[PDB]
Amino acid sequence: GLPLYVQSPKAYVRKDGDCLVIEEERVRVAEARLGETSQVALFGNATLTTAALHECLRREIPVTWLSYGGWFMGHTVSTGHRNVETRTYQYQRSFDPETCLNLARRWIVAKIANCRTLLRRNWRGEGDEAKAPPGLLMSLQDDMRHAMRAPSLEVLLGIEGASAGRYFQHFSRMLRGGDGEGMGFDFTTRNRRPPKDPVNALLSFAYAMLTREWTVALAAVGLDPYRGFYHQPRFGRPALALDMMEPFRPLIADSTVLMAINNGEIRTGDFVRSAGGCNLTDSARKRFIAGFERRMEQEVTHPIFKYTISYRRLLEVQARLLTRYLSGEIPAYPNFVT
Amino acid sequence: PRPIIPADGRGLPLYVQSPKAYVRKDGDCLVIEEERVRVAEARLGETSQVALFGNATLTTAALHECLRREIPVTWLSYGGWFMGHTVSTGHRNVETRTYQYQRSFDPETCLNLARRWIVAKIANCRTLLRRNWRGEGDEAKAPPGLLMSLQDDMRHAMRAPSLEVLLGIEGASAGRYFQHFSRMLRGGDGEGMGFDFTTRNRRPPKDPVNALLSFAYAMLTREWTVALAAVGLDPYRGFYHQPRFGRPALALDMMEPFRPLIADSTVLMAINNGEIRTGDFVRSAGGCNLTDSARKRFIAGFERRMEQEVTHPIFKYTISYRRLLEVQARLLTRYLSGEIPAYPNFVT
Amino acid sequence: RGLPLYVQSPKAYVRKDGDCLVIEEERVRVAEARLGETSQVALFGNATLTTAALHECLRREIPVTWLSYGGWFMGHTVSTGHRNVETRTYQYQRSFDPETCLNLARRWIVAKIANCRTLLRRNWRGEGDEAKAPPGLLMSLQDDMRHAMRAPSLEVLLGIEGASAGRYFQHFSRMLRGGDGEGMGFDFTTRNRRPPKDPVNALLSFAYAMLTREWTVALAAVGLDPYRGFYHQPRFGRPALALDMMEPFRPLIADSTVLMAINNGEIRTGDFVRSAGGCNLTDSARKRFIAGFERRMEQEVTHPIFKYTISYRRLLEVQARLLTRYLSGEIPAYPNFVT
Amino acid sequence: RGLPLYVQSPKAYVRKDGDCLVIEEERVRVAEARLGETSQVALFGNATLTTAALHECLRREIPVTWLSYGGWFMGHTVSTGHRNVETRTYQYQRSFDPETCLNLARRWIVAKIANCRTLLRRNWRGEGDEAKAPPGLLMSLQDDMRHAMRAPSLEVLLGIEGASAGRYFQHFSRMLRGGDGEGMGFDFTTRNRRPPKDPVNALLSFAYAMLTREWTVALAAVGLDPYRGFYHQPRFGRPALALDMMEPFRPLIADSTVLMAINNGEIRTGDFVRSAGGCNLTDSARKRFIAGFERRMEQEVTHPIFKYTISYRRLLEVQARLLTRYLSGEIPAYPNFVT
Amino acid sequence: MEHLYIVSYDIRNQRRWRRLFKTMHGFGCWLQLSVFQCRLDRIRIIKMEAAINEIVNHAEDHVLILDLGPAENVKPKVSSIGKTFDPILRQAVIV
Amino acid sequence: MEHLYIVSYDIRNQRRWRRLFKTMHGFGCWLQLSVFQCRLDRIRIIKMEAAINEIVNHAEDHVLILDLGPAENVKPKVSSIGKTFDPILRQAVIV
DNA sequence: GAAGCC
DNA sequence: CGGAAAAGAGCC
DNA sequence: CTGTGCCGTCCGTAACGTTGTCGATTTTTGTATTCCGGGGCCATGATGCCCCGGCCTCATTGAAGCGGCTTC
DNA sequence: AGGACAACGTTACGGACGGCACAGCCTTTTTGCTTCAATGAGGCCGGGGCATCATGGCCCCGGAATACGGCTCTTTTCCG
């Protein structure tokens, strides 16, 4: 069902009948319809009666606990036998190298198609045409031609490395349609360990936020986000965020560092090259996270079926579809290239 | 091999058995307020868990502070029938529970553990007999014709062909043992201490002590589940106890050895200390139930049992049952890695 | 130098000018006591005597002492020198040569008996039948006198004084308000017991005990050790010099104080609550007994050698000076003060 | 027990505040001592003290004395009785036998001339052929040590000890501050002169007098008197027996305070006004000096015979106790405490 | 390794008082009209003088910790002329 | 045999206050706005709870003694976030 | 000469 | 000098 | 001129009745692998200085024994 | 608790000072001489502990330090 979100950190959730009706001040405001529902996203200080909750726990409906902004606090796992089926399947297919590689290939072809989805639009560095060099476009198409058959999780790594360097050496070509003063991406790191650049102060921050929702809309279902098929975990790597965020690694935390400077909000007059690439103004941080929520609430459609929703509802139904693919109903994983 | 770190532990659990409580964060203490009248308050340094024994309201400010300190709230139905639990996007290690899931899918591991997992419960059921068998005349010690048959059941279990035959043996030595249980209390059941062990396993208890058993068991369950989320294991992938809603499929499997040491050694102080007089009870409405007059006493008994210092056989060093639960979880992990081939079991 | 003086005022001021001392009182001038004819001085209450004044005083070793708000003596301060050590060593050497000790003791018991029958004659309150003491009574007391003057040894004086005291106590119930008053009883043998028994016994014992304190302060102001005398020989902290200097002044002051306390008809045995042993004076009764003791002092009786018809503390330090000078100075002997 | 109360500021006004003594210096308090923690009380001459606090101090029987401006000690209270006349008689009768007086004197010399040169050779500061004990001065001063065995009689005693101390006296300004300080010189002919001539003889005079009091208090504690002196004949200026039993401790403490005063540098010549007595000590050093004496007398040293470690004030009290035991007679020889 | 530590605080400003009150009350129980008590180990006393030592000014505010014995022998070394002295008990708050 | 004992008194009535203030001030020095300190042995602490324990009511008055260490190792087991902590010194009051 | 007094 | 791999870039 | 006795008369102690309401962290993460390093602790002498006590000395009051002469 | 908390908003109680303003006081009776009862007073140590103070040999976390495998596109002396 649709995952309810206790939105206003003023509300009051309760169970009247078979619907978790929420309440503003002594006023009914929404009907939950327990028959078709999922997690209730609890925001800053919006409360629920300890009678609805002792129903959610009964019907294996995870109850989330987010701070006022959306910052994640721990979950409320129902001790049933529905979620641990999902964790069982995740850790069972986890070490099955065949399906592991199959997932990996689907993920990387999705990411490549999504990154190559920045043709004609975004990259506006026109001069003569923003339309990306058909050499580059067809090189990405050939890279997908490769990736739809890559017989290891180390051939895939080299393929992804090549076809990320190539198009991280084309960034500025889609930054301002050129160089906005200060915003010209040094064709360099995506800022792995320390920041080294302005865009390398935005393309690791924005990614750092993308990790959050791909960890939480994964722990929004019985999926252990720390066991990933693609990335072999190293004691603290949300390896099922990283096996999972790939087709949204360009889709979200790139189209939000872009429009934060494509629309010209962010200028070198908002960050300081302080012992690293940059560190934003707290106001710059706030407007950036704002634009992040613009994208996160930017709309999309058709997860597997015609259904037009914000990026969070898709960003969770993706995990649901994953579980359904894991020995469940769906026999082949839907992958969602736009 | 040879675990060197137990967890010292700063706090100790808070329980809320009152079904008309209300819990507000106040500064750093955790005040509970009752019909706008306070009762108690826990210093959040001194809180190690939280349990809500029934419909006792909570305020989300407390959840946010508690997870902001990561102290596991554990929602619980009236009979301590473990229902809910809070988890913060998984323990931040993967190697431990991947070892868990991996070995679980191995069927041999389950059997090897179900055996040492069921032999370690019988071989302390019988010593509890040979410790709490209240003989009066021609009875001062339990009959060796029984203390053999429990041993006879032990040799039936160390040779289990499967993982359902072993459960059958568990049930076979949970009927004989409970037939002989009624001898344990007040020199024989006194004022309506009717251990109708036929009603064993019945969902709402029919009898007084069964309504105390199915509570001491059903809160040892929670205690193991908390101690099995500290080493970072996943207390839901059960080697032979399949997941049952309300039953952490492995917390029901690493308690089986401590079902007699910690549960049937607190029932046999609650009853053997006048903490259950059949007039202490909600005599009906659940088959039978318990009255909060004795509930706040039995929880105290259980907790003080959980704070008893005993030696651990491998190093003879003395530790509370809680810290011992976590040391034993540690041994489960470092056998799960195959580090230690066998599994030191803590029989007594 | 001259006879000492004492001061009282609770917020007074004692200061020195050149060669005299003026006891100012809240910046009010008084007579200038000339240092050439003054001696030890007491301080009552929270007075003010400057330190420099007592430095200049102790230069000449003129003494000084500290009292209560009234006259309850507690403390003293003394300088070193050669006269002070001379007096102490003279007392202790006269605490070793016994012939002088007996020269004083014989006359001491003799003067006690003399003042005793003098007190019998004076305080005879047997009106109605005997306006006089029996001539046999005074005759036998003078016989006790001539018995006591027979002392070439350190001896019988004890027993003869005991007999004299016994007879005086036999007639001391006649010294009551007119007869053997019921509730005013007196037993000659049981006097001076460790507890009192009669109110009369309590007054006599308390009077002797309080008189011993003025005796010991008179000893202390001069440089004579109060702890060394032989009428009650020095053993474990006695006022032994005072104990050897108290008997003839029992009839003069202490017995006289008891007489004027009980004859004058002011204090009533309602204040004399019954104790286990004896009717000890209550707060009011004790205070009135102290007042009678004081009133025993101020009246003027002089000795012919020093014509000081002033009071009895002017007569209570004169014998201290007399003893000091008999030890050291030019006085030929120690007179008896037999009135 | 308690701790000493020294009052040196010339304008101190000590007034009781319950069991806390709050002094005043022109309408402002300076310091407070807990009356229970008060051991004794010494006043310099000009500093006054309210009479309420005084006759409460003797009510708490904490002893009182007055220094002069420079500590002549004409003022010292008497507690009106120690209640041990037996020890009094002991020490009087024993002073009346000159054998004990002279032999105690000679053991005082041995007590101050049998380990005194060893206390100056263990901390001597020279510059050349003087660092260690002078070879020509070790045997030269050893002649008096062998001549201090059989003391003839009072007259010769009074001389050589001083003259032999003269040999010590000359050598006083040979360790302090590595030769004469920044205006410090011990003219060994200026010792024992009523006007404080040298800047250092002022310090030594103050030390000697206040240690004289520090011995008088020990005498009072066991009932001894500083009045009767063996070879220190009673002089109006100084307590006699106090000198008689401080003389061995003049070097070890009274000289030690001046020695540590000059050598540790807290004594600076820029602390005097002179030409009155030849030199006179002002504040900022006298306050430092007397407290300097204070630190020395509180640290603890073993008793040679009783083998337990005791404080110097308690050591002096035990020395007086040992005098009393000598009066008993278990010790033919006085324990003279040679280091 | 745990002792009983009594905090004897006396500040000067309510804007700092209320904070200190609630904070150090979060450590231990109210004891006396200005003084609380706590039963703590090394790490938590460190976090005490971490949480305390900046809520207060260091000139106009006086606070004073008191490290007593290991909190089980605290009874001998403290007595209460008024009410009783009760060390806080490490007990499961079953309420 | 001497320790340092801190008296943490907080009583209600000035007619008892002034007396307690002056009295127990006669034992040791002012320390904090309601709390004093003293350095005492067995006999004098006995005489403390002799002089104290009747100046106060035993219902509306709370007082609390604190037997610390032997007063020379008091410095380790107490710290003062505000001013300094100073055990009272047994010293001759040369003033 | 004996025992109470003192 | 047209090749051609080897280096080093990029990125994983 | 030292309690002490209320008369004041401020602080700076805690209770409780008001509207705040705030705040979320942070800018990777590609396989492995062996240090690097302090969190940290049962375990183990080790020494400390908290008194367990206890027979060594002092003392200070009266149990206890008793001076002589007159009268019964 | 419908945001259920935190900060703040003014007035119960205390605590100490200091401001003046009165008083203003106090104390048992035992003296005949040993010896001691003996209960109060500390003072050296026997070995009865003992809170940290070192390891310290482990347990590891939990990042970081290289240290490489990988894929395509480009780029210093060199082989043929």
Coordinates of C-alpha atoms in Angstrom, one line a residue, chain F residues 23-79:
Chain F
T23 CA 28.1 28.0 66.4
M24 CA 29.2 25.8 63.6
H25 CA 31.2 28.7 62.2
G26 CA 33.0 28.4 65.5
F27 CA 34.1 24.9 64.2
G28 CA 35.3 25.8 60.7
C29 CA 35.3 28.4 58.0
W30 CA 32.7 29.6 55.6
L31 CA 32.8 27.6 52.4
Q32 CA 29.7 28.1 50.3
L33 CA 26.5 30.0 50.5
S34 CA 25.0 27.4 52.8
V35 CA 27.8 25.0 53.5
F36 CA 30.9 25.3 55.7
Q37 CA 33.9 23.1 56.2
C38 CA 35.9 22.0 59.3
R39 CA 39.0 19.9 60.0
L40 CA 38.3 17.8 63.1
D41 CA 39.2 14.7 65.0
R42 CA 36.9 12.2 66.7
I43 CA 36.4 14.2 69.9
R44 CA 35.7 17.5 68.3
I45 CA 33.3 16.0 65.6
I46 CA 31.5 14.4 68.5
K47 CA 31.3 17.8 70.1
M48 CA 30.1 19.2 66.8
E49 CA 27.1 16.9 66.6
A50 CA 26.7 17.7 70.3
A51 CA 26.6 21.5 69.7
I52 CA 24.7 20.8 66.5
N53 CA 21.7 18.3 66.7
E54 CA 19.9 20.5 69.3
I55 CA 20.2 24.0 67.8
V56 CA 18.0 22.7 65.1
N57 CA 14.5 21.2 65.0
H58 CA 14.7 17.6 63.6
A59 CA 11.6 18.0 61.4
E60 CA 11.8 21.4 59.6
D61 CA 15.6 21.6 59.7
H62 CA 18.0 19.6 57.5
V63 CA 21.7 19.4 58.2
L64 CA 24.2 17.0 56.7
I65 CA 27.8 16.3 57.8
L66 CA 30.3 14.9 55.2
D67 CA 33.2 12.9 56.6
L68 CA 35.9 13.2 53.9
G69 CA 39.4 11.8 53.9
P70 CA 42.0 12.7 56.5
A71 CA 42.1 16.3 55.2
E72 CA 45.6 16.0 53.6
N73 CA 44.3 14.0 50.6
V74 CA 41.2 16.1 50.5
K75 CA 42.4 17.9 47.4
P76 CA 42.0 14.8 45.0
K77 CA 38.4 14.0 46.1
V78 CA 36.9 17.5 45.6
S79 CA 37.0 20.1 42.9

